[PDB]
Design a protein around this ligand. Structure first.
Ligand SMILES: OCc1cccc2c1OCCO2
Ligand SMILES: OCc1cccc2c1OCCO2
Ligand SMILES: [Cl-]
Ligand SMILES: [Cl-]
Ligand SMILES: [Cl-]
Length: 163
């Protein structure tokens, strides 16, 4: 575990993370995809061997000795708000189990279902709160990766509020 487990946020490509493992915002079929998933495919293509897994689950595949945790958030274009919320919560709980099993001291994580799976809604708070519910009981350093400057400020504020 980390000496003083923390949350941090960085605005940069998650493929250039400084953590001991990465969470991919994966699709259920283990395809290269777009956004975070395509950056992860470019950086760790070996991690997409038998990475297909259902919505609401996480499957880890090693790239050398570096773990890639494929986490499948719901596409809110297809799920009801109620069922999508349940699957999004579940995906993060499976990420917490994998992070724990791997024995890493740190993990790089994107906000699941906030891009092309968002169904055109802002889900920063929804996705971040499910991330916290899952990861609060873990002792890994968590570093959240985002693209947008306004999201960086809102994520930083949400972390500092609980402190
Ligand atoms: O530009 C900042 C930035 C932030 C997050 C992800 C990015 C990125 O740049 C292009 C590659 O992907
Ligand atoms: O455009 C989305 C995207 C693409 C590539 C890497 C990213 C990322 O967003 C979160 C931070 O890491
Ligand atoms: Cl970058
Ligand atoms: Cl997404
Ligand atoms: Cl973002």
């Amino acid at each position: 575990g980390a000496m003083a487990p923390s949350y941090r946020v960085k605005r940069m490509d998650i493929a250039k993370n400084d953590e001991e493992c990465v969470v991919n915002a994966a699709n259920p079929r283990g395809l290269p995809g777009d956004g975070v998933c395509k950056a992860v495919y470019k950086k760790w293509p070996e991690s997409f061997k038998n990475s297909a897994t259902p919505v609401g689950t996480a499957k880890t595949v090693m790239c050398g000795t570096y773990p890639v945790i494929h986490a499948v958030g719901p596409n809110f274009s297809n799920y009801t708000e109620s069922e999508g919320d349940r699957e999004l919560a579940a995906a993060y709980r499976e990420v917490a189990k994998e992070v724990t099993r791997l024995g890493v001291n740190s993990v790089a994580i994107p906000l699941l279902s906030t891009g092309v799976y968002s169904g055109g809604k802002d889900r920063l708070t929804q996705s971040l709160n499910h991330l916290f519910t899952a990861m609060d009981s873990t002792d890994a350093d968590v570093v959240i990766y985002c693209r947008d400057k306004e999201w960086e400020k809102k994520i930083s504020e949400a972390i500092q509020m609980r402190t």
